[PDB]
Design a protein around this nucleic acid. Structure first.
Lengths: 324, 320, 324, 320
DNA sequence: ATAACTTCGTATAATGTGCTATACGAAGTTAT
DNA sequence: ATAACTTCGTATAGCATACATTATACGAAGTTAT
DNA sequence: ATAACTTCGTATAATGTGCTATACGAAGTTAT
DNA sequence: ATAACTTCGTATAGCATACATTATACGAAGTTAT
């Protein structure tokens, strides 16, 4: 609570900045730039943040038509800056506590809907599969394997990029299989092994036949394919998540065409579409919530439950009673 | 200090919305009452003196009011003080002790907190068997309302907030109703309340004859005037007084006009289908874990309270 | 924290003493007399109670070979006296908090076993039933009905004494039935109706034939029977719980004879024996925990679970797996 | 103040017993370590300076110790301070942040907290199929120990505290074992761990050949010397080092001597039957609610950690 | 008129975070 | 004199009301398109 | 001897109240 | 020139490490009845 104390705290912050993910840091800076500009504009002090100002700001975020979860992030990062610096948190103020409470209320009462990825189900896999199965085109074959390793496995983006060729050993009738390393938590796991079908395996093949992947196995399975249709292997680099999420966007447009309704948020297939579809498919096929809240490494149902909610199978006991 | 206290309270009024409209309704209702009693005995209503509050509670008790009502008066007074940054009346033995004593004396004389008359499947099936045949807008609406009420267990006000854009469909054709906020939860995630095929038909039929669908941002249920014309609106919801009247009206229909007693719960009301469904489910052998998901409860005690009626495992063990 | 403040608090305590059951008050005085004597003896001040003294005292209770639950009651009542008087609780002290923690540990590690009532099951009801069924003796017939209203119903003592003759209306084949009022909680119930068999009803009869109960129905079902074998009705009074618990003690001795092993605690049948037996019987007969944690008005299983624990039916999943 | 702090710590030592013998073992173990590091760099070991503690944790990390061990060192230091009425080292950013960073750096290099090698029913059935035939006291005891371990899921020390007067019987003949205190619960109520008919026989046979029953206040398991003579005792329990050795010994028996690696968990150990039973139950389709009652857990996370191995719902959905 | 509300006041019942990743539209970077 | 209780007191086992809201119950009193 | 521990130190994994009633042995109270 | 990315930044959805203990792992070093 003295400029010297705060100075010490901020030096502590920088010295052990690896106590947080670079993503966290990204959002911290992001919010600070947002809050600071606003302060400048609205003639106020940005550090330390004063409860009345942070209030005005939060209402400004709301008026900006920003989501409740987003405003949370803002107060959140601000609370973190003051906590890691020796100063009082904005949340610890009555004004800020109340306003947050009010805004949450006001927004829900107007339509605010959290969104999630658009399901990419077998009904979608088969379709694309039928549209790009006979195509000579490199990046066309690659994108099908992806759509395969992805629906078939439910692996996250950050993880499908990480795959290396060795990891893809084989099995039962020449069925493929794979060691991932997904978890990044200590008391969790070091990793699993995942398998493929006569479908998803027969595809992932071609990619390898054409990708020239069978070259220096320290190689990754997924690489970029240039405009001439020639792939570029690289044991040193990984298809950015943007591109991978790109194949899902691209593919949806192929079938459904140009970007649509309203101007933003989940109109086409995104990185999570495959998991979200497999799950329902696996739920529709009456597969215990184990595999379901499991084929994805799901440590908490609320998530798999928000995914299979509109499914008739998840209708409720009252519907069951009512219908006998 | 006087300055601070003026601020804290002022700070509360500014973000009025952080609280339920009702919470404010009661805060003001108690204050009115308290303030009234205070003026009668020449007492300063704020800050409140434990001794004066004690006299007030006892006064409430003498009026023959319910323990729950007395407790509400203490709760509001407590909030006023606490939110002001002042000591709560309950923070003193005179007040803590008198409350306990009032409850105690009251219950040890019987006094019991009531609950809505159950509206169960038999009741639903009977009401529907009769109203199904009506072509009147009102009956069509009312039958749909009761259908959702029983099916979903939603509360009057969650039902009254259902907007047309809130309905969806399972692939199989069942209607899905998305619920944003409830007594126990305000999140942007919300819940999806599915409707049986039959309640679904009931709802569809209402939508049709009413025209609410003429604006996705329109409240599903609305007034229907003497001439049968439904009055759709995206700005004003049907009042809970109306929604609850549908229950009592339906009851009157099958069982006649109610007692002259003046008691409460002589006919079905807003909570009748919740009480009744919970029960219906318990009987069906439904799991507590699942019964709770039905009513949106996060805990297990209301759920248990509603059942305690059904037996005879005994003459049975003894007879053989 | 001033003698005037404490004085005000204690006057508050007395003025609204009905904020507690007379049983609570009984234990408060009980503990205070115990603590005070000790203080006198051990040359200390009893009010306000000083953390070090209350510590010594608790260890003294322990050395007295007193149960953990008992010492809890002592600290408990002391904490209540200081809380309702404006002074700091003894529990709020580090010394007292630690010692309590240590004693709890030390005792468990030596055999301390909470006890419960000895089961009085159908195997016991039938037995006594076969020993006192042909006996002309008034108090012999009375004690059998009791053993009946009690096993058959699972009603608490305090409640079987409360029964009045009207409450005993009839039913299915001339089966008896009964409106009790058990609960004394607001958001609970006002009460239930309970039934009897060809057994428990055929007995409760005689008692009425002989008890002369069918006289002024404001009467209670259970009265005292004097040494000459003549019963004494009374709409104004109730068989004390001591006597009722007496019939269970008496009856056990009849079959098993004189008071036994060690010198104390649950050697014979007590007021709770009947419930405790019915339950297991109802559990052995595979009756869902509903009625079980219900025929007694049980709002919490831990209790019915501690009663059916040695029952094979409650053995566990590992036993189930192990045995196939 | 120096006076108070001397008291609080003195107040802790007086009621030593409020804590596990082990908690004390580690407090003293860390202090020894810390104090050592401190003397090496000429630093005052208490009260501790965040900066000095930060240097200490990093030092621990450089020693190549586990995140859990480093955390334990911080926990003990934290306790010393907190219980003294002083500020906790973790109460400072240098310490809070370094811990996170250490964990983070460590895990993002793999590092994972291990768990005991599973000892499942197949393992039990195999070990028993073999040892059943031995008439040696040791084998008889060991087979009984493993039987209870797997059956009950008890922990080494709860098993090592079982006294003869603690066994009962269901009417059907199954042995019941009453457990007073455990890692997660010290109450006079206790639990009753039932044994299958088969494990029951195993236990009976041990009681018989050993004579522990010669004193109800005798510990069920005890040493058995080179000559086969069991040494019963009501004052000294069999050491956990012994009980755990039974697991590793049994393992050696079926699979040979262990790696030279020096790693941990190369053979079964104290927790092997808990890990294994939990799993066995999950496979059997047992309910989480019930799996938890088996292991005495009150929560749901260790239970989940132990399973994550078993699959293929996919080639399956895809193949058809 | 009047059905069918609304409104509104007092009475009374009912309930139980904070770090890290992805989403995308942009803007920038290579190699065709 | 005792059997058959009652009341007592201390020992222990069995429960389940207090927070801080936010909602319903129900009608009287006012409203508006018919 | 030596099997089979014990002990003990450092390493590292695992877990998650407070009011009111009953129990009894006693002591006291009536009516046989 | 662009296709096919990469890196950016802000918007939002998806998770899951920090307390305060109390326990196990495992062997070396010491022990005691054989």
């Amino acid at each position: 609570a003295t400029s010297d104390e705060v100075r010490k705290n901020l030096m502590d912050m920088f010295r052990d900045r690896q106590a947080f993910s670079e993503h966290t840091w990204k959002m911290l800076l992001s919010v600070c730039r947002s809050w600071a500009a606003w302060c400048k504009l609205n003639n106020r002090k940005w550090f330390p943040a004063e409860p009345e100002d942070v209030r005005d700001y939060l209402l400004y975020l709301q008026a900006r038509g920003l989501a409740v979860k987003t405003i949370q992030q803002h107060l959140g990062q601000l609370n973190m800056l003051h906590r890691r610096s020796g100063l009082p948190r904005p949340s610890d103020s009555n004004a800020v506590s109340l306003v947050m409470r009010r805004i949450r209320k006001e927004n829900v009462d107007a339509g605010e809907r959290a969104k999630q990825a658009l399901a990419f189900e077998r009904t979608d896999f088969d379709q694309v599969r039928s549209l790009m199965e006979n195509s000579d085109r490199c990046q066309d074959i690659r994108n099908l394997a992806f759509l395969g390793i992805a629906y078939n496995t439910l692996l996250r983006l950050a993880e499908i990029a990480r795959i290396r060729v060795k990891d893809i050993s084989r099995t039962d009738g020449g069925r493929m299989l794979i060691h991932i390393g997904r978890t990044k938590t200590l008391v969790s796991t070091a990793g699993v092994e995942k398998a493929l079908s006569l479908g998803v395996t027969k595809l992932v093949e071609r990619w390898i036949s054409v990708s020239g992947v069978a070259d220096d196995p320290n190689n990754y399975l997924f690489c970029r394919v240039r405009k001439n249709g020639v792939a570029a292997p690289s044991a040193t680099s990984q298809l950015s998540n943007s591109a991978l999420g790109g194949i899902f966007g691209a593919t949806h447009r192929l079938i459904y065409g140009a970007k649509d309704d309203s101007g933003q948020r989940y109109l086409a297939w995104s990185g999570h579409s495959a998991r979200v579809g497999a799950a329902r498919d696996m739920a529709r096929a009456g597969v215990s919530i184990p595999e379901i809240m499991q084929a994805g490494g799901w440590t908490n149902v609320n998530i798999v439950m928000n995914y299979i909610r509109n499914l008739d199978s998840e209708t409720g006991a009252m519907v069951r009673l009512l219908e006998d």
